[PDB]
């Protein structure tokens, strides 16, 4: 058996669709389905605050009492009594009357607290006050109108305390904020607080606190929205990136946002892509591009890379994609033997292969460079993959080899499994270049060489179950992609099937049902040479 | 005995066959009777295999212009016949009733052919029955016409089952039946039609005429004409369209329904007056009264038949034509039968062909 060149089945995915598809009936107007929906002053002051909170005369009388009580309180220089009793009366005051009534209290609070550190001793009281505000106040714009809150913030010093306030404030904001819109002032204040949080961060702070804080930030972030203003949105993002360096996941959100903006902009333009559209496109591209390096989560960064890729594919940026691929490639060696997630170490190779899998498909979707060697990139990636220190259970390598042949098969196709928009691929140029086809086949054969080598090595290795599965796949693939009109390859497929059976660690049930499937497929007319195979395939069995 | 076998071996005018080949088509394949190419086309129209599986009813029996015909289809079951045969439909043609005995001799013929493939040996069996009214089989225990008197074929019908199914619809059926009136039966299952309809000559059978049983009539003009040759008639059908036609039918039975239909004048001639109440009573008992089997029910219907015949009998004179009587129907009305009994007497004297005009 020489280096017998693989040659492929030909398939009309459209005809295959029409055969395999079930045609569902469009269901009738309003028809059934299972979920069709067919004695000091302050002491009495506070005591009175309790009684009034419980029971009170009419609002006008409450107002009178407010004036009298708070006036005396302003006269009351003693800050501790002042803060203690005011905290109780505040709830009742905000409960009945509008903002300004309390705003007076705010002013006098600022006055009494300002001259002396004791307000820092009163930090809890300040917190409870704001929490009470939270319960009673819910529309942001009024708080912005209730500008006293800014002096309130300014009064503080203790970063931590402030941060606590921020957490509470923003969670309440989230509970209230359900409107995806904008207000520059609203943004300004929020952003200021956000930076307060961000700068509060240090390298030393607990990652969990970091995470939660970030996540909250992230929530409002999702809420941030100015509708149809790609450039404003963009810029805001840029600076956001600038400041909010303190946690990457957060930044990924921005990344995602970029993507969303870009893609939707693309869709609404409907191919009617002006200079503006394409520049905007490229800018999203870059911003994103530059981001990943800044990032850390390599695996994540990789899928991010491929998204970057595909959007560039969506956006006509070939060599750009190439760069990203080079990057992915560069990350490939980076992938360590074990990676830690959830605090725990897991065999990454499984995961990276999963990526690789979707990437490979992604491969053929690319239009290549004429200058660059026709899919050289592909080989580089695979070769490097093999260069990784794969231990035993390399067989996953072999899985990829298999699948790579499936890809090679698509390249072999004079027409590809899908064709995307304006996207071009070597098919779209070459229309079945015999030369390209042959070179591809040669590449396949290279893989097939590796296939034979390791499989029989595994035979030397008594890895009869794993090797057996590998042969299982090999024959399966040959079936999907091949023509037994290479009688030689058909026979080698028999060699496989019985070789697997002669070592015998394979599931004989698998093999039996497999053979049954072989005959069931073989039944079709072209499959008569598969019928020749399936009968010419007897089967040695554990049974 | 033997005279009946010689008659029957005239009547059994021979075998039909149709099949299908692998080139793509169902086909007639040769066999052994006195052919009639027109009637041959008619039988082809009988052929269930003509629709490869509309309902590939595996057996049919039939009668045409008093000539009976008998049919088997098994597509192709496991046998050593020529594998070109994709489908098969064996038939015979007759003037005689023993569908079961035909089923036997045919099963003999068929299995013999299923071993050999040759129809000519099976024709040897045709010849054997021809010569003897009997056949041995290599494939089977032997068959004798002595095995299966026609009255055995007549016993097979359960009248109880039908009358328990049809109640006063059976009073409709009765009043059409006795008076020589045009009876239609519809069920899409030819098997059920065959069973029910062949039971229908059993009803009143002592008033013997078995030739009536044309178990498969087509709506073709020639076939409808042939049924027109009949007057008291029962023809079987598997589609509703015959219900359209009380002009054509005195009764439409949907056996798919368990329903029986009254023709326009029959709505008086079969109106529930005195005799038809008597019949309502008798048929309620024929469901309900257990004492008497189907043939015994025929005996008690023969009691009613002798009642009506003897009502006619002294009131009627026996003509110079000798065979039959001429009825003073005016004197029968002077008897003053309550109106439905007197009407049934008149209509049966028509059915007896014993009128005076």
């Amino acid at each position: 058996m020489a280096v017998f060149p693989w040659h492929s089945r030909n398939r009309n995915y459209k005809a295959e669709f029409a055969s395999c598809r079930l045609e569902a009936v469009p269901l009738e107007f309003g028809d059934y389905h299972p979920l069709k929906p067919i004695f000091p002053k302050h002491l009495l002051f506070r005591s009175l605050g309790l009684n009034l909170a419980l029971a009170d005369p009419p609002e006008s009388d409450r107002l009178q009492i407010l004036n009298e009580a708070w006036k005396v309180i302003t006269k009351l220089k003693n800050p501790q009594d002042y803060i203690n009793c005011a905290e109780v009366w505040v709830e009742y005051t905000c409960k009945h009357f509008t903002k300004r009534e309390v705003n007076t209290v705010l002013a006098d609070v600022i006055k009494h607290m300002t001259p002396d550190r004791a307000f820092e001793d009163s930090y809890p009281q300040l917190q409870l006050i704001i929490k009470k505000v939270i319960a009673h106040f819910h529309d942001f714009s009024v708080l912005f109108s209730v500008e006293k809150f800014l002096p309130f913030l300014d009064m503080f010093q203790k970063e931590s305390v402030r941060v606590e306030v921020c957490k509470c404030i923003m969670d309440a904001f989230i509970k209230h904020q359900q409107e995806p819109t904008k207000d520059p002032v609203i943004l300004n204040a929020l952003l200021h607080v956000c930076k307060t949080m961000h700068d509060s961060v240090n390298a030393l702070t607990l990652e969990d606190e970091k995470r939660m804080l970030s996540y909250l930030i992230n929530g409002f972030i999702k809420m941030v929205s100015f509708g149809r203003d790609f450039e404003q949105q963009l810029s805001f993002y840029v600076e956001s990136r600038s400041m909010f360096c303190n946690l990457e996941p957060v930044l990924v959100q921005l990344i995602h946002s970029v993507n969303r903006l870009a893609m939707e902009t693309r869709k609404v333009m409907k191919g009617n892509h002006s200079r503006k559209t394409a520049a905007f496109v490229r800018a999203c591209v870059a911003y994103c591009f530059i981001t990943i390096p800044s990032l850390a989560g390599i695996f994540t960064r990789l899928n991010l890379y491929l998204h970057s890729g595909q959007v560039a594919l969506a956006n006509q940026c070939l060599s750009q994609a190439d760069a990203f691929f080079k990057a992915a490639i560069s990350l490939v060696p980076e992938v360590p033997k074990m990676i830690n997630i959830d605090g725990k170490m897991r065999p990454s190779e499984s995961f990276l292969l999963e990526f690789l899998c979707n990437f490979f498909s992604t491969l053929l979707i690319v239009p290549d460079h004429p200058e660059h060697g026709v899919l050289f990139l592909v080989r580089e990636l695979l070769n490097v993959i093999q260069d990784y220190t794969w231990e035993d259970n390399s067989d996953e390598k072999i899985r990829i080899y298999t699948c790579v042949l499936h890809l090679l098969s698509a390249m072999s196709q004079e027409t590809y499994l899908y064709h995307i928009d304006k996207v071009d691929s070597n098919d779209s140029l070459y229309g079945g270049d015999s030369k390209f086809l042959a070179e591809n086949n040669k590449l396949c054969e290279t893989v097939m060489a590796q296939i034979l080598e390791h499989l029989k090595t595994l035979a030397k290795d008594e890895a009869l179950k794993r090797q057996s599965s590998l042969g299982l796949s090999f024959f399966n693939s040959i079936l999907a992609h091949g023509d037994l009109r290479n009688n030689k390859l058909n026979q080698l497929s028999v060699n496989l099937w019985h070789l697997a059976q002669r070592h015998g660690c394979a599931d004989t049930r698998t093999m039996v049902k497999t053979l049954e499937y072989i005959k069931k497929q073989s039944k079709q007319p072209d499959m008569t040479h598969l019928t020749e195979l399936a009968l010419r395939l007897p089967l040695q069995t554990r049974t | 005995m033997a005279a009946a076998e010689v008659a029957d071996t005239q009547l059994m005018l021979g075998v039909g066959l149709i099949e299908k080949d692998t080139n793509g088509e169902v086909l007639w394949v040769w066999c052994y009777p006195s052919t009639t190419a027109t009637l041959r086309n008619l039988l082809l129209r009988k052929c269930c295999l003509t629709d490869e599986n509309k309902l590939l009813h595996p057996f049919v029996f039939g009668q045409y212009r008093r000539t009976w015909f008998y049919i088997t289809t098994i597509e192709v079951p496991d046998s050593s016949i020529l594998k070109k045969v994709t489908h098969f439909s064996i038939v015979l043609t007759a003037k005689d009733f023993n569908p079961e005995k035909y089923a036997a001799f045919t099963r003999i013929l068929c299995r013999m052919y299923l071993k050999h493939g040759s129809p000519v040996k099976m024709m040897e069996s045709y010849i054997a029955v021809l010569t003897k009214g009997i056949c041995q089989s290599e494939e089977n225990g032997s068959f004798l016409s002595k095995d299966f008197d026609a009255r055995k074929a007549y016993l097979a019908g359960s009248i109880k089952d039908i009358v328990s199914q049809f109640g006063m619809e059976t009073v409709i059926l009765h009043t059409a039946l006795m008076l020589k009136k045009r009876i239609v039966v519809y069920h899409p299952k030819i098997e059920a039609v065959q069973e029910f309809t062949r039971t229908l000559p059993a009803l009143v059978w002592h008033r013997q005429d078995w030739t009536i049983l044309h178990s498969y009539v087509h709506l073709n003009a020639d076939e409808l004409e042939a049924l027109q040759m009949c007057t008291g008639y029962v023809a079987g059908f598997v589609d509703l369209e015959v219900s359209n036609r009380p002009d054509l039918y005195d009764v439409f039975v949907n056996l798919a329904e368990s329903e029986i239909t009254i023709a326009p004048l029959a709505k008086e001639a079969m109106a529930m007056g005195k005799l038809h109440k008597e019949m309502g009573q008798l048929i309620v008992q024929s469901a309900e009264d257990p004492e008497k089997s189907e043939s015994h029910v025929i005996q008690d219907i023969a009691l009613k038949t002798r009642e009506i015949f003897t009502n006619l009998a002294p009131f009627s004179e026996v003509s110079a034509d000798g065979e039959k009587r001429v009825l003073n129907l005016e004197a029968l009305k002077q008897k003053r039968f309550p109106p439905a009994t007197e009407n049934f007497l008149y209509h049966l004297a028509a059915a007896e062909q014993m009128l005076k005009i």
Partner: protein
Amino acid sequence: MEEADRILIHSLRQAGTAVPPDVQTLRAFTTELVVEAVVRCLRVINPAVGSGLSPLLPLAMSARFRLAMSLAQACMDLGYPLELGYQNFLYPSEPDLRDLLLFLAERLRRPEQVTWAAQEQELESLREQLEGVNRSIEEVEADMKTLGVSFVQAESECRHSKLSTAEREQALRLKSRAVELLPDGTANLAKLQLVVENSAQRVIHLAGQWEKHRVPLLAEYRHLRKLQDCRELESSRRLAEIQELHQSVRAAAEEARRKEEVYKQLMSELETLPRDVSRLAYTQRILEIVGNIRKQKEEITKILSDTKELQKEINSLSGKLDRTFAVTDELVFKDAKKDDAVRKAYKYLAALHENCSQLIQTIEDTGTIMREVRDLEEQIETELGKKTLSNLEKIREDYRALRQENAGLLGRVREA
């Protein structure tokens, strides 16, 4: 901020201001260079003012002030957030200039009764005969009806009679036949039975012949049907094939037209396009920077560890030190009780550990002071970025010139 220096290049290119050779930094500039840029900036962006002041450099110093005041106004065109004016417009720190420049770059007894009777009589005479004729006609019609029925009746009886006659003929013939057979009944019976059975054998013969004749006909039929279908399928397939290939070829020609015309567009585009420094170059630069970030971040990260372990080492040391001194000082005092000079050694114990604390503290202080040094040096950097002394020299000579100028102006006010 050399990347920003590349933005300078960018800004110069967009403005159409040159990049003279050493004009690679803000450091190079004179005020005119910038303020010219500002002229370009609004003259692009707000020409209404921006047309106002030529890129021609002024020399009326008052015009320098006032044109510069127009620059402040140009900021007032939107309000770049910082302070404005000729003071700035004289030669500020490069950060400031850079920032503002960026702000710019972005937005880019009467006769009848006697005789009439005899006349109408003529009607009546015919009317009666008419009715009588009609009577006779109806009569004959009835006769024809009855006779036709009777005729058909006779026809029916004739048909049945014929039937009976035929039956009699057959029965009579058979009876004669039986009479013919009467003399040799047994022998005739056996002979005839044998004859019948042989004739049936002869029938069997013909059935075999006719069978065997029959089979070839069917086999040929089958053959012709099979070739019929094969032809029909074949034709259908070639037809479908060529339909599809034609349609695809059509689409390919359409695309060829589109491609060719676009290609010439691309020719025009090649004609148009500039040849600047590439996307790649900045890509590389960024990545370099990226690496920088990674490396020093990672170095900080090692340092994070180093701190962690170093402190826990110090912790262990502190515990061992405290317990060490407790045990040691206890024993030393126990010994000191013996003798005044042992007490002197104990004195040296306490004083030594004190001096240890002293030195440690001094080291701490040194660290703090050197942190101060960092701060001060940063501030120095700040002020030299303020070009601070040179800007002294600038404002001294400027204010000198303008004080002198204003004194001349006062003189002219009094003179003129």
